[PDB]
Amino acid sequence: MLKIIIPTTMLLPMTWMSKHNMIWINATVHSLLISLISLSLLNQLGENSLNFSLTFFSDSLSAPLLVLTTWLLPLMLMASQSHLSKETTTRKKLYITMLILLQLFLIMTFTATELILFYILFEATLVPTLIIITRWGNQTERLNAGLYFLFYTLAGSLPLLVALVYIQNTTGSLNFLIIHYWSHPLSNSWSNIFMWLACIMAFMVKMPLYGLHLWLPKAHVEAPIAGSMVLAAVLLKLGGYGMMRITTILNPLTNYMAYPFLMLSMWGMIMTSSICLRQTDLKSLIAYSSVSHMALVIVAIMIQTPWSFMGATALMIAHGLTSSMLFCLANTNYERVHSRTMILARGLQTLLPLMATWWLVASLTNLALPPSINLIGELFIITASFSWSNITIILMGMNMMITALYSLYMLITTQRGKYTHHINNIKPSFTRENALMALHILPLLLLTLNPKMILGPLY
Amino acid sequence: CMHAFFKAMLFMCSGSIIHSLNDEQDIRKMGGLYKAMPFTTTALIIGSLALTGMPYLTGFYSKDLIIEAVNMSYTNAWALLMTLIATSLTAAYSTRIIFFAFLGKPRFPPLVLINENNPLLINSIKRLLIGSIFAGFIISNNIPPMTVPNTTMPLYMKMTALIVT
Amino acid sequence: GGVHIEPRYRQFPQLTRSQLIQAEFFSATMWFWILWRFWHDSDAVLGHFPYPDPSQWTDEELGILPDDED
Amino acid sequence: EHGHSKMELPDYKQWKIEGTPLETVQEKLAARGLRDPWGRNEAWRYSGGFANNVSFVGALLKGFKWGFAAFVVAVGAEYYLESQ
Amino acid sequence: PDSWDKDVYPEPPRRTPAPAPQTSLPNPVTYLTKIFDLLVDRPVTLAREFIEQQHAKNRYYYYHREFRRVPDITECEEKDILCMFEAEMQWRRDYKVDQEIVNIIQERLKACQQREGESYRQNCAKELEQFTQVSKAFQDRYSDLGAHYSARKCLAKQKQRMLAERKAAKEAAAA
Amino acid sequence: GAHLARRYLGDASKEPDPLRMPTFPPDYGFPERKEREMVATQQEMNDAQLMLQQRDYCAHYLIQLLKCKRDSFPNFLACKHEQHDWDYCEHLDYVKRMKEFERERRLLQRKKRREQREAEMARG
Amino acid sequence: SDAPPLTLEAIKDRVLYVLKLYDKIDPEKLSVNSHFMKDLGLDSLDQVEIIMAMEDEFGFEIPDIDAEKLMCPQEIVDYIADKKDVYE
Amino acid sequence: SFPKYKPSRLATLPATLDPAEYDISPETRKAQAERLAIRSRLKREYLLQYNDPNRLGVIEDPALIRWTYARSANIYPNFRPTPKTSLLGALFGIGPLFFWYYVFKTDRDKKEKLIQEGKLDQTFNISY
Amino acid sequence: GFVAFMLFMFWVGEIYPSYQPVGPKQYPYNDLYLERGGDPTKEPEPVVHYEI
Amino acid sequence: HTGQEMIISNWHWMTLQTVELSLSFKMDYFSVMFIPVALFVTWSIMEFSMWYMHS
Amino acid sequence: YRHSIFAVTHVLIPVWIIHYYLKYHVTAKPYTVVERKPRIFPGDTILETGEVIPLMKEFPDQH
Amino acid sequence: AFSAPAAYLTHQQKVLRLYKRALRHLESWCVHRDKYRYFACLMRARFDEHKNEKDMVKATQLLRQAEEEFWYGQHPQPYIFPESPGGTSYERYECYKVPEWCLDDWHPSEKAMYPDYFAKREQWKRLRRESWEREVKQLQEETPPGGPRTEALPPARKEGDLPPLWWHIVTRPRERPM
Numbered sequence A: 001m002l003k004i005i006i007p008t009t010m011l012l013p014m015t016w017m018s019k020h021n022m023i024w025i026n027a028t029v030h031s032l033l034i035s036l037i038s039l040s041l042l043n044q045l046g047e048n049s050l051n052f053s054l055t056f057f058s059d060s061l062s063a064p065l066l067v068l069t070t071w072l073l074p075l076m077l078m079a080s081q082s083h084l085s086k087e088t089t090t091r092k093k094l095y096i097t098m099l100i101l102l103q104l105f106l107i108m109t110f111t112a113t114e115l116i117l118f119y120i121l122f123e124a125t126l127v128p129t130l131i132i133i134t135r136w137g138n139q140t141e142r143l144n145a146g147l148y149f150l151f152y153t154l155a156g157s158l159p160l161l162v163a164l165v166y167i168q169n170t171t172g173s174l175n176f177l178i179i180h181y182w183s184h185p186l187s188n189s190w191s192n193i194f195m196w197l198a199c200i201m202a203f204m205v206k207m208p209l210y211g212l213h214l215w216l217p218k219a220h221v222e223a224p225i226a227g228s229m230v231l232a233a234v235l236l237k238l239g240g241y242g243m244m245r246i247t248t249i250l251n252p253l254t255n256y257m258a259y260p261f262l263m264l265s266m267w268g269m270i271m272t273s274s275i276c277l278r279q280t281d282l283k284s285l286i287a288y289s290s291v292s293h294m295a296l297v298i299v300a301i302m303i304q305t306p307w308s309f310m311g312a313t314a315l316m317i318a319h320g321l322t323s324s325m326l327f328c329l330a331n332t333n334y335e336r337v338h339s340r341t342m343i344l345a346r347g348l349q350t351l352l353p354l355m356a357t358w359w360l361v362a363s364l365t366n367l368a369l370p371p372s373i374n375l376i377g378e379l380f381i382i383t384a385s386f387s388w389s390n391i392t393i394i395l396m397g398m399n400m401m402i403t404a405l406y407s408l409y410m411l412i413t414t415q416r417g418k419y420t421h422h423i424n425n426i427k428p429s430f431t432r433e434n435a436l437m438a439l440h441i442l443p444l445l446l447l448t449l450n451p452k453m454i455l456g457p458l459y
Numbered sequence B: 001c002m003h004a005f006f007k008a009m010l011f012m013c014s015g016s017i018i019h020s021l022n023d024e025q026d027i028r029k030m031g032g033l034y035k036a037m038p039f040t041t042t043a044l045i046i047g048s049l050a051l052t053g054m055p056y057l058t059g060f061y062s063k064d065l066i067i068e069a070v071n072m073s074y075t076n077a078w079a080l081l082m083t084l085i086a087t088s089l090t091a092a093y094s095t096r097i098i099f100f101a102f103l104g105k106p107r108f109p110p111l112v113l114i115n116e117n118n119p120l121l122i123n124s125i126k127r128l129l130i131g132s133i134f135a136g137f138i139i140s141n142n143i144p145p146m147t148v149p150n151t152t153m154p155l156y157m158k159m160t161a162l163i164v165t
Numbered sequence C: 001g002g003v004h005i006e007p008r009y010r011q012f013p014q015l016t017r018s019q020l021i022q023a024e025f026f027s028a029t030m031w032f033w034i035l036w037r038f039w040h041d042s043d044a045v046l047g048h049f050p051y052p053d054p055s056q057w058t059d060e061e062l063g064i065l066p067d068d069e070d
Numbered sequence D: 001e002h003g004h005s006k007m008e009l010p011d012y013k014q015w016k017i018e019g020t021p022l023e024t025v026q027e028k029l030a031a032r033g034l035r036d037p038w039g040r041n042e043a044w045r046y047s048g049g050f051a052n053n054v055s056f057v058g059a060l061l062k063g064f065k066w067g068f069a070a071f072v073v074a075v076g077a078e079y080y081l082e083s084q
Numbered sequence E: 001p002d003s004w005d006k007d008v009y010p011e012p013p014r015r016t017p018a019p020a021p022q023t024s025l026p027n028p029v030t031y032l033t034k035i036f037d038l039l040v041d042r043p044v045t046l047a048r049e050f051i052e053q054q055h056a057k058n059r060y061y062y063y064h065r066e067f068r069r070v071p072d073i074t075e076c077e078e079k080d081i082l083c084m085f086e087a088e089m090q091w092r093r094d095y096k097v098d099q100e101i102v103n104i105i106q107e108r109l110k111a112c113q114q115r116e117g118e119s120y121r122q123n124c125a126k127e128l129e130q131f132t133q134v135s136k137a138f139q140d141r142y143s144d145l146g147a148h149y150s151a152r153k154c155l156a157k158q159k160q161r162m163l164a165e166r167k168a169a170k171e172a173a174a175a
Numbered sequence F: 001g002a003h004l005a006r007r008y009l010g011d012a013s014k015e016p017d018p019l020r021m022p023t024f025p026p027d028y029g030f031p032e033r034k035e036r037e038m039v040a041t042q043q044e045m046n047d048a049q050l051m052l053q054q055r056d057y058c059a060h061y062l063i064q065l066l067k068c069k070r071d072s073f074p075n076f077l078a079c080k081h082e083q084h085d086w087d088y089c090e091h092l093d094y095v096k097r098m099k100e101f102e103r104e105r106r107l108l109q110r111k112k113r114r115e116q117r118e119a120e121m122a123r124g
Numbered sequence G: 001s002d003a004p005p006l007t008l009e010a011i012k013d014r015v016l017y018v019l020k021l022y023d024k025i026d027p028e029k030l031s032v033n034s035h036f037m038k039d040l041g042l043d044s045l046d047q048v049e050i051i052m053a054m055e056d057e058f059g060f061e062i063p064d065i066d067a068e069k070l071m072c073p074q075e076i077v078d079y080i081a082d083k084k085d086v087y088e
Numbered sequence H: 001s002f003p004k005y006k007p008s009r010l011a012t013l014p015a016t017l018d019p020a021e022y023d024i025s026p027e028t029r030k031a032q033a034e035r036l037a038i039r040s041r042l043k044r045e046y047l048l049q050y051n052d053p054n055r056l057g058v059i060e061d062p063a064l065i066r067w068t069y070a071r072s073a074n075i076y077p078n079f080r081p082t083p084k085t086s087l088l089g090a091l092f093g094i095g096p097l098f099f100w101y102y103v104f105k106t107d108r109d110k111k112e113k114l115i116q117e118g119k120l121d122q123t124f125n126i127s128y
Numbered sequence I: 001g002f003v004a005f006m007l008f009m010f011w012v013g014e015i016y017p018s019y020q021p022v023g024p025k026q027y028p029y030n031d032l033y034l035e036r037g038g039d040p041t042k043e044p045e046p047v048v049h050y051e052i
Numbered sequence J: 001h002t003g004q005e006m007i008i009s010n011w012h013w014m015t016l017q018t019v020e021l022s023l024s025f026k027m028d029y030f031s032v033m034f035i036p037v038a039l040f041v042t043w044s045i046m047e048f049s050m051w052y053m054h055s
Numbered sequence K: 001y002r003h004s005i006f007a008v009t010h011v012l013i014p015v016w017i018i019h020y021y022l023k024y025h026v027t028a029k030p031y032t033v034v035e036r037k038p039r040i041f042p043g044d045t046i047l048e049t050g051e052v053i054p055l056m057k058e059f060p061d062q063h
Numbered sequence L: 001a002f003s004a005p006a007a008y009l010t011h012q013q014k015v016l017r018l019y020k021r022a023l024r025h026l027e028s029w030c031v032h033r034d035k036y037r038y039f040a041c042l043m044r045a046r047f048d049e050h051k052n053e054k055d056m057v058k059a060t061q062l063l064r065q066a067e068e069e070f071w072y073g074q075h076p077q078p079y080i081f082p083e084s085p086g087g088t089s090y091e092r093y094e095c096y097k098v099p100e101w102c103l104d105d106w107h108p109s110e111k112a113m114y115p116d117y118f119a120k121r122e123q124w125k126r127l128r129r130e131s132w133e134r135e136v137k138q139l140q141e142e143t144p145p146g147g148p149r150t151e152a153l154p155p156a157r158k159e160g161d162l163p164p165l166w167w168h169i170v171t172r173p174r175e176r177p178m
């Protein structure tokens, strides 16, 4: 596993010893090379795992997430190349350093043979994100947003740590293999109820669960483009990965402790979706869409069936890619208009047709159009929930409809109609933005050919 | 299969009329077109006659059997009543279309630009014309049997579709 | 790829003999087909098998006793 | 290749209310004491090829004569070759 | 085709009728298929023969991996992690084999319904019965284990089912 | 249908109900009671795989129709005779069913008449 | 489409043509620069009817505010030309 | 006389049917004049900014900024805990959750009871 | 009113169906017992039909 | 001519435990009857659209 | 000539590829291509076995 | 649309507008031309009966009942011209309308084609650059204290002067650009 970690660490000295006008080129090239290297993790077995060492192990649940995390960095570099043009060389190198540190922390988080190491890295990913949000942000609200994005997360994660050490004092080990093999049922008790709550809320606060989601719109809107990228793509999936790993020991309590949360998700996926219908901001709409998708993922995980797990994994991967693309498109519009309001710039399809094509493809993919992996995950989760209960489909059906509506609403308000008359600074789209959108969208349509790569360990 | 042919032909005829009439869709400004444009006129008459199930046309070989099977079956009486009234209203709206857009004195603006002399339009219309005329017979007689026929009927129940039409 | 036709401005637009003869031919073909199908296949509309009268059936084949035996 | 032939507007004095239903409209209006100032404006709708009309039955029976003639010829040929 | 076993995937003799032309008029189907043969099948056959001779010029073999048998979960100590590891891997392999057996029976059933055509309900009874039996056995073995399934949970399910059956049989005998 | 009007506006018990028909034994009328004859055996009717709804007593004529349709394929109006034969057999089946309906109706008529006569005699 | 590119001469010819069949206006006294209320002595309702006649002739309808202040054939021609973007 | 038209929320009153337009007082005329004066001033400002050759950017609209700010950021500072607000928040945030929980719990309890009784016919139920 | 009247008349027509003065259709081999479902090891009660 | 009917299950997409999803085509009466009619209608509509949408 | 080149490049090569893939790859696996069993009527003879199906009951005929 | 709106509508304007609307809806109701002519003449006769009325109160009482009679019989599906705000082709060609300043972003390879057009465009740009400097001061001098009272602009009064705020009125794309 070190053959991926060491190049990521070497990304930093290369960045800091580069010339003043070659930092982006070297960073992008070597990040792409590291992605090509990390592609080799996709070769998995139907048996236990790829146990490289006592410290790091890989599975068909961790390999797709690692590949996505490693592939995300060059896209963030291309996105951030634009608005950091008038910056000092030292500050640009600091930005790239923060991005590299975040990628390294995520890479070491997704292997994590041990639970305490997983917690340490899962909480270490918090610092570069906060610095990126609060330092290179455009508006005055960013500081407040950062506070939210911090404390919510900590409020969830501090009890979990205690629970973790308690398990080590009772089970004797926190290694995931020993935990899996030596699992024992949880008796129905108040102590076990609170242990379950402590183990679960830490990951539900970062999904985010409905009602604990007020930090996400702030963090997504006030962050720069790379921050929104990494928040919507990878950081949301930490809670999903943690939940799948952690549960193996929460049975059979999860049979009845899931009731308060499933409802909170089953209704929540509706509410946030409806919120998307009445919005005056693109970033807020994308954030609420992400909240709804993660609510469906929460339902999938809490159902605890193999089809649920497969659908959840596919949905996390697809949603990460799609949300990154949507944020990139919104940022490209903002960098021209400088307002971030849906109703100001209209009829951009006439002026920028290829960007309108990218918008249409991103909207269709977010709309869960078959045979995309978005729909694969959605349908697997829906079928598993139907097996859980025949009435759930109703809510799910509703959500689907609402989703499509606001998605096409985003496409119609911004791209369709008559252009704003007084705006005359809409320059033709560069090659950089088009390449960014193409590199975003091609992996989804390629992954739809081989779904078994992203269906998890239960395939 | 039958609806495909005759409805596509009807829509193409309507589109030809709209294009020749300077992108005007209201029938309140379409007058004498039985003589002003002959091919669209005859194609639309053939389409309306096939749609209303004139015997031994494309619509007959399906719609008449539909009416026969619905009447001679264990169903709700309201269902047959609504189906018959719907057939009558189908005849009514076909009559409305033909009467308003062809028979009346022309109501379009003075600058007449009506013309039909384009090979693409004529060929595209005539292919579905021959389809709407002969596809019913050929397809009905060229498929294996798949249901029990209604050999015996009362005289009034056998003629009901024509009566309401 | 048609021919040149000029607007008439409140006069009947020009018509060529080709479209007129084509329309007449197609209408005549439809009506000939209708008449030919009616002649060769008349039982499709009028019916081929007469409908029997249930009241006309004699009671012998109908299996009823003269209201006394059973 | 477009229609640039310098079409000429015909004289304005041809359009007459005589011989059209607008005459009946004028009679009915004068029976009350009025006049239509735009009666001649629409006269071209009844002057040229628009004068003759066609009924619904005639419109449906567009090619009945020639189709009937072809049917009679076909049935005569059929009768003459079958009886052999 | 010899690429698969005819006993694992049985097929009827597939009787086909002989052509019995009643009229002297020539049908277009035989002419069309003759020209299709001449214009498509011969070039494709020649290309396949060339490719097959190229493959025969360079031949090499690959083998099916044989796995030994190890003690199952019923003979493992409490915390003896190595033998539980071996038994768990063996159980997972057996689970995969069971899934593929059910897939084979489902394939047989799907093929039979299509082959039977109109009289499918009566004819496919043999396939349907086999699928019902295999599905019942599979559902008894593996259903309701959960996302975090293991050999221990399957053993517990079997133990509870056997206890229930023993109690029911004892009650019936002592009725 | 007129029977619908007679049942829904007149006496319901006077005329039969198609769902539970027939309500009277087959031998109530006459003891001759010749049985229906089936020509196509199970094996050939299964091999032809017609349909489940076409497996009636008129199946042999359907077999002949399919034989002609498959044999003289391109000239699709050649074998018209077996179509007529199958239609005739279907018509015979339907008039047989109508005869059954009329028999049940008049049987119910005479049964109700017998009950009314017995009640009147008992009263008098 | 196949619609000829109508010109200013065509617009003026059609406008004068339409105004001549208006039997209330004498064709002899009618001119391209003749005022409606004064030179031809027409009422406001007759002006509205003239506007509607032009609307039916040209296939497009003029807004009421713009139509109510068209008092000469020349300015009607100019308004129609500016609407349809006629060069000559 | 003719049948009257009754306006509603989604079908408002026509401008021509309004009683108010017909009755006119001088104060009304002055109000219309000053409304038009304000509109003309705003239009003059917009046209002066719009036609300027040296401008190569977005003409900022204070009204749009005010609308977005009031819709997004001005909600909470003007919020006041009121019986109407408390009742509506409690209802729309608590009632649906309990309703759906009750429905799902009843359905699942019925299903589990039927499963224990053995009369559910789970034949061919393999994937879950 | 239109929707309610349609629903009520649909229910009424359901209560008062339409059919022909005909008996049930008769099928030869024990009401097609073997071909519909099967169970060839049961020997069911034979149903014989009435030729009139 | 005969009543030929076929399924082509050509490409095996994936397998979820005991469920097999593959690229399968059914060539029954409905498919072979609705194929030419749709193709014919689309052909005629495209030929007409060449003229209708010329500008 | 345009018609011939279109017919050779747009129909012939795709059908060659498809037929090769179907005959030598798809068919090689079992149950990939399953065809409806051809209908059998009384009186036909079978190519593979050569036996003849017996005729029916010789039921009454008239009209 | 081209004429600037007024602060209000007088009685005469409202009478004319109701006359126009009633005639249009009558034409929609009376499909054929002769019937429409007859009923339009009858409506005109019914309309000028009160033409010579003098007092304002009764005249305002009229045009009200008339407003109500119009609303009762307003033909819920009236005829609309295709380019009108309710027509089937109201904004059909609005997606082909591209702003002129887009031509400033054309690549030099694209500008190599059509040299004369871009030379004319540069001439127009120079003319606008001088004209705006003149018109801003002309408008400043013209306006009354307290700002404009109507959205009506004055014409040019000098020799080389041009009407103020003309660039975005003259440079409209087209009616049917494509």
Ligand SMILES: CCCCCCCCCCCCCCCCC[C@@H](O)O[C@H](CO[C@H](O)CCCCCCCCCCCCCCC)COP(=O)(O)OCC[N+](C)(C)C
Binding pocket: A188, A189, A190, A193, A210, A211, A212, A260, A261, A264
């Ligand atoms: C705000 C946005 C959402 C954030 C996340 C919210 C989700 C957190 C909800 C916590 C889950 C439920 C808590 C406990 C579940 C156990 C079931 C229990 O509550 O039900 C009954 C319990 O009865 C009563 O509830 C007793 C507890 C009464 C006190 C609970 C407070 C009720 C409202 C508090 C809500 C506050 C939530 C926010 C905290 C800041 C069962 O009766 P009983 O059979 O006897 O007990 C069975 C358990 N045994 C076997 C171990 C004994």
Ligand SMILES: CCCCCCCC/C=C\CCCCCCCC(=O)O[C@H](COC(=O)CCCCCCC/C=C/CCCCCCCC)COP(=O)(O)OCCN
Binding pocket: A152, A155, A156, A159, A162, A163, A166, A191, A192, A194, A195, A196, A197, A198, A201, A202, A205, A212
């Ligand atoms: C975004 C906000 C979310 C914040 C997180 C909310 C979740 C709160 C989880 C509970 C907090 C404490 C978790 C306990 C850690 C696990 C260890 C454990 O459970 O062991 C229990 C100990 O259990 C406890 O002591 C738990 C008591 C709780 C103390 C702290 C209270 C904090 C607030 C509780 C209510 C909040 C829960 C719901 C919050 C909803 C979200 C707002 C048994 O201890 P023993 O004595 O060894 O065994 C008994 C037999 N010998």
Ligand SMILES: CCCCCCCCCCCC(=O)SCCNC(=O)CCNC(=O)[C@H](O)C(C)(C)COP(=O)(O)O
Binding pocket: G043, G044, G045, L011, L012, L013, L015, L016, L022, L025, L026, L046, L047, L048, L050, L051, L052, L053, L054, L058, L059, L060, L062, L063, L065, L066, L067, L069, L070, L071, L073, L074
């Ligand atoms: C089809 C839907 C139903 C339609 C029904 C609508 C009701 C129709 C009947 C309306 C009755 C009336 O006229 S209500 C009568 C309202 N009162 C007056 O009209 C008095 C003064 N008239 C004017 O000032 C005019 O402008 C005039 C002098 C005519 C022109 O002047 P011009 O010199 O500037 O053209």
